[PDB]
């Protein structure tokens, strides 16, 4: 899809990959709504754009992506203030990792709430409008290569959630396509510069690419896992 | 591990795959605790074994695997009544499929609660004892080939949950290994006789196999997905 003239709503938008994506979407003609849990991060992020004389095209919303009522409110605020959005970037995450025997129900609940239910809540809250407005759109979900390559037990919660996000994104593709909404799952490793990731995401939105991986260092470990899965099949 | 003289706790144990696993574990010398949400199913399953003079080796518990308090109760009752368990089969599932546009938060919460949090709750409630008793054990989680091969959007919730269970099982392996507890993820297709699946699980427990797939029909479709993932990697 064409990025020019669109509005992008970006969770975890005040730092890291989310902020790199923000920069490159704005550079390609999008207006921005940055959502994040930290007030100070959001103000710093908009100040960056302020210094580049683009403050009027960036709005910020303090948001907990696990709060479904807040997510619905944010979708209405986005539409009112900046329009749309046409582009939804579900990028917020957290890392609940630690010795697996020390893991608690609270770790599981929080880990899944942000990393898995965040994107689900975004899809639930934003797609009714994205479908109804009828001008297409795009959804990017940030997963991780930790959702694909074999991971150790101290990363069980994170890996489990991010694997789910990969399959979620794959599986909703046909449903979203009915209303000309493309989907992409972003699978980072160690974050390469955020604006480089941003440009990969620009390409994925423009050309409707399902998969974006930032690194290839786990090609062989992934291949080995994939082969073991295949070998299990009679 | 040797199955003879062990106790197996099996969720969704009163029908389908769970009951086939129950049958073959008992045939290999395990005592059984069958857990299921349906009391009438449990009664029928109990009767089946009673008529084959195996009644005193089977115990039934009505259980909602998404209820953590009930799961804690079940672990206490299992240990008291039948001992152990040495073998934990997290097999309960449900399918909230339907047009993805019409999916509700309730569909997602139910789908994830049973299919993903069920096994997590089983692990959390049962593995402390399995570790403490110090005689090792085995955990089988029932996922699905739907968690691996590309699925249509109307199956998004099920596919998402089952993909997560595959990764859950992979990642916890090294933690469970510390206490000589092996793990297996079972990935079924269309259910082939349940007892045939049961024998695959006997083999997995005896030989500590990480993966069991019941069908080879999705080899090529999985290969294509895996290749697309690999191709995304720089």
Numbering used by the authors:
A (entry chain A), B (entry chain B): 1 to 191, 229 to 271
Give passages from the manuscript.
A cellular pathway has been characterized that performs β-aryl ether (β-ether)3 bond cleavage using three sequential Lig enzymes. The first step in the Lig pathway is a stereospecific oxidation of the benzylic alcohol in the GGE substrate to produce β-(2-methoxyphenoxy)-γ-hydroxypropiovanillone (MPHPV), which is catalyzed by nicotinamide adenine dinucleotide (NAD+)-dependent Cα-dehydrogenases LigD, LigL, LigN, and LigO. The final step consists of a GSH-dependent lyase, LigG, that catalyzes the elimination of the GSH thioether linkage in (βR)-GS-HPV to produce glutathione disulfide (GSSG) and γ-hydroxypropiovanillone (HPV). Our structural and biochemical studies of the enzymes in the bacterial β-aryl ether cleavage pathway reveal the features important for substrate and cofactor binding and catalysis by these Lig enzymes.
